[PDB]
Design an enzyme around this catalytic site. Structure first.
Site, PDB file in Angstrom:
ATOM      1  N   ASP A  89      18.824 -42.811  28.024  1.00 44.92           N
ATOM      2  CA  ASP A  89      17.896 -42.479  26.948  1.00 44.92           C
ATOM      3  C   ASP A  89      16.720 -43.450  26.941  1.00 44.92           C
ATOM      4  OD1 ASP A  89      16.815 -41.094  24.830  1.00 44.92           O
ATOM      5  OD2 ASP A  89      18.060 -42.073  23.306  1.00 44.92           O
ATOM      6  N   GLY A 131      12.449 -49.150  10.359  1.00 50.60           N
ATOM      7  CA  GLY A 131      12.477 -47.899  11.093  1.00 50.60           C
ATOM      8  C   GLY A 131      13.727 -47.117  10.760  1.00 50.60           C
ATOM      9  N   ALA A 148      18.085 -41.282  14.469  1.00 48.79           N
ATOM     10  CA  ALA A 148      18.936 -40.106  14.361  1.00 48.79           C
ATOM     11  C   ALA A 148      20.281 -40.484  13.743  1.00 48.79           C
ATOM     12  CB  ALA A 148      19.157 -39.459  15.728  1.00 48.79           C
ATOM     13  N   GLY A 182      20.596 -40.414  10.646  1.00 45.58           N
ATOM     14  CA  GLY A 182      20.188 -41.039   9.396  1.00 45.58           C
ATOM     15  C   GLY A 182      20.477 -42.520   9.262  1.00 45.58           C
ATOM     16  N   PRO A 209       9.722 -44.940  25.459  1.00 48.22           N
ATOM     17  CA  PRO A 209       8.926 -46.015  24.848  1.00 48.22           C
ATOM     18  C   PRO A 209       9.403 -46.411  23.467  1.00 48.22           C
ATOM     19  CG  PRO A 209       7.506 -44.345  25.814  1.00 48.22           C
ATOM     20  CD  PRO A 209       8.889 -43.783  25.823  1.00 48.22           C
TER      21      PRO A 209
END
Lengths: 398, 398
Positions: A127, A17, A20, A22, A130
């Site tokens: 934050d 995965g 943010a 990068g 899911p």
């Protein structure tokens, strides 16, 4: 080609995965352990140092992602964490719930446990969504669990502090942000209940199997500020959806002071087994047996009770039960008194009346909750008058 | 001078303990974490590799010591584990139990949980003793816990295998070894219950505050083979010691087939709260209300019951209670029926009769168990006839 950076050793072909700033998550190894490896850019050496620090001191809880190690490099820092099977988003999107039973609710309870653990350390996650709620690999007995992750946005409040300021840091992820984080005219600082708001949306996202209380992506954050929410997937005359609606409505309340704490959420009947629901009904029935009909507790219980028992509950239970029964048919208290007796005298009940009730305790309690889908929610709300009493400590929090 | 061996970094002046095969435990650091560092000789690179492997796959349980990392060197291997406050031996030897409450029993329950976790992975610890049962540092809320450690002697049984052979490896630590490990004429292989035997001795070691069921050091292992044990610290007419004796006697039984599993131990009333004890009494009283006096369940309950109720239990309860009472005074069933009624009708009881009983539920249940110290143990043993029934699942294991 397997890159090695000390004890951490991963293969760049095994990407899992991206995130943010990068950052990329790869599969790898740490100490003959299968792990997930986060690669951190030099522009997040603080985003990592704060996340790793808070993870180092809260990963004791089984529903917080386990942190192993960080190896810093010449151009990078790497984070070794527990390797998970999927995120909660991928779980809701790709799994058939007909073959899962009560597991989606267990993941929600485990998520809440890990959240209550964070709040007990003065840590606001800020934050919750899911995407960063991870599903573990099945253990030796084939069991899975949910775990909170992504501590990059979360704050440690000083001891004593109830709240924190909006101005510091990004507000969160669009579509899951509590309205007090973004509303232009907000006279009260955000507090631990921003996580309860996000959790409330996650709750609906799981049981609605993919929807959001505040609508589709493009609108939801603007619907959050308008308070324009809808829980359409919860049927108003099904016992389970009524219970979930009562909890979710409070968790996503616009007033943050009305949102339950994570410890309140863990106590809500949304998580009770059928056996525990039947024990609650028996406990309040015993509690109010010698209570005056015009006393505070019985008054609150009958307040709006005619709709709960459906005008006459004697006309809404099967005929074999209607027979062997003095009971006021508009009284919630008398409906509970009937259930208390049929449970107590169950062994001595006729066969055909034990038949329609079902087996103690699962089918028995479903006999009544399915016919009166507001009975438990109404009784739970009314019997909050005794939440402080020792007898009801299993059912409330204080 | 702080030695560094990679991610593990410790100071040799901070020694914490030593072990067989000349291994030394130092205090140190791993990843900004305070840890305990084991130094391993080249003559135990297998003793370490097997311990680290089994620790890597069972440290998921909170009552198994947490394993962090191993750094191998040029002449050594090092093991990073969770840094603990003390061993269970140092705890019993140096702590005043008057200021600890139910904590020593909690450590015993946590130790049993971690043992049941090992047994559920087909892992026999084989060396359970107070020395390698560690006490954690207090957490953020000041709480401590026990954790199993020292996996050097423990075996993973193949799936299906019930037992293992004596001939492989050292038998254990003298004075805590199950007799089937050493007895010359043993026709049955050791199994998971060797850990239950050791655990039984640890149980007595903690509640006797330092003694051993099989006597002092020089004799105990030879007393183990003779079966010569004594539980003198358990008073025969105190409710708590009677409960502990019933459990400990079974755990240290010479016949390994008579020793309870770790899951049975976790269910024993030795760990029940006062509230749960009162719920057990109410559950069996409800269970046997409409049961025939000459049926199996009531027969077993009255079997030897006159000594339990002390010939006439009506003559052994305080006068304010003697008044408001049809009850056969030699019947255990009728004593439980009295308790069932006084608990149910407690709110409506006279003041001076609620006074002598005490508060529900703690003082109420102690009123009866203190006067009849064999009531719970006798009832628990007799009501095993219903251990399979759903109602009694909280109290037994099957």
């Amino acid at each position: 080609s397997v890159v090695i950076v000390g004890k951490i050793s991963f293969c760049p072909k095994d990407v899992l995965g991206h995130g943010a700033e990068g950052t990329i998550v790869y599969r790898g190894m740490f100490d003959n352990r299968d792990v997930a490896v986060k690669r951190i850019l030099p522009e997040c050496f603080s985003f990592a140092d704060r996340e790793v620090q808070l993870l180092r001191e809260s990963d004791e809880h089984p529903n917080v992602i386990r942190y192993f190690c960080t190896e810093k490099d010449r151009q990078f820092q790497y984070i070794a964490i527990e390797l998970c099977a999927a995120t909660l988003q991928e779980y809701v999107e790709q799994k058939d719930f007909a073959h899962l039973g009560l597991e989606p609710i267990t993941l929600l309870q485990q998520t809440t446990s890990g959240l209550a653990h964070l709040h007990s350390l003065n840590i606001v996650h800020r934050d919750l969504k899911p995407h960063n709620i991870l599903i573990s690999m099945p253990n030796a007995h084939g069991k899975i669990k949910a775990m909170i992750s992504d501590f990059g946005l979360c704050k440690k409040l000083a001891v004593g502090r109830h709240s924190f300021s909006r101005r510091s840091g990004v507000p969160g992820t669009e579509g899951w942000i509590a309205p007090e984080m973004l509303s232009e005219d907000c006279k009260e600082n955000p507090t631990y209940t921003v996580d309860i708001f996000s959790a409330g949306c996650v709750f609906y996202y799981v049981i609605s199997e993919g929807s959001h209380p505040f609508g589709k992506s493009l609108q939801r954050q603007a619907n959050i500020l308008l308070g324009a929410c809808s829980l359409d997937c919860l049927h108003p005359e099904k016992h389970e959806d009524v219970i979930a609606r009562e909890l979710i409505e409070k968790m996503i309340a616009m007033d943050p002071q009305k949102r339950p704490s994570a410890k309140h959420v863990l106590k809500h009947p949304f998580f009770w087994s059928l056996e525990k629901q039947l024990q609650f009904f028996q406990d309040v029935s015993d509690r109010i047996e010698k209570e005056s009909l015009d006393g505070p507790i019985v008054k609150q219980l009958e307040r709006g009770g005619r709709a709960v028992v459906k005008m006459d509950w004697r006309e809404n239970i099967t005929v074999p039960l209607q027979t062997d029964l003095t009971y006021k048919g508009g009284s919630v208290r008398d409906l509970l008194r009937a259930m208390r007796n049929k449970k107590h005298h169950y062994r001595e009940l006729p066969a055909e009346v034990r038949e329609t009730l079902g087996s103690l305790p699962d089918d028995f309690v479903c006999y009544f909750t399915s016919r009166f889908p507001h009975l438990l929610a109404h009784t739970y709300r009314a019997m909050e008058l005794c939440s402080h009493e020792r007898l009801f400590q299993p059912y409330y929090f204080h």
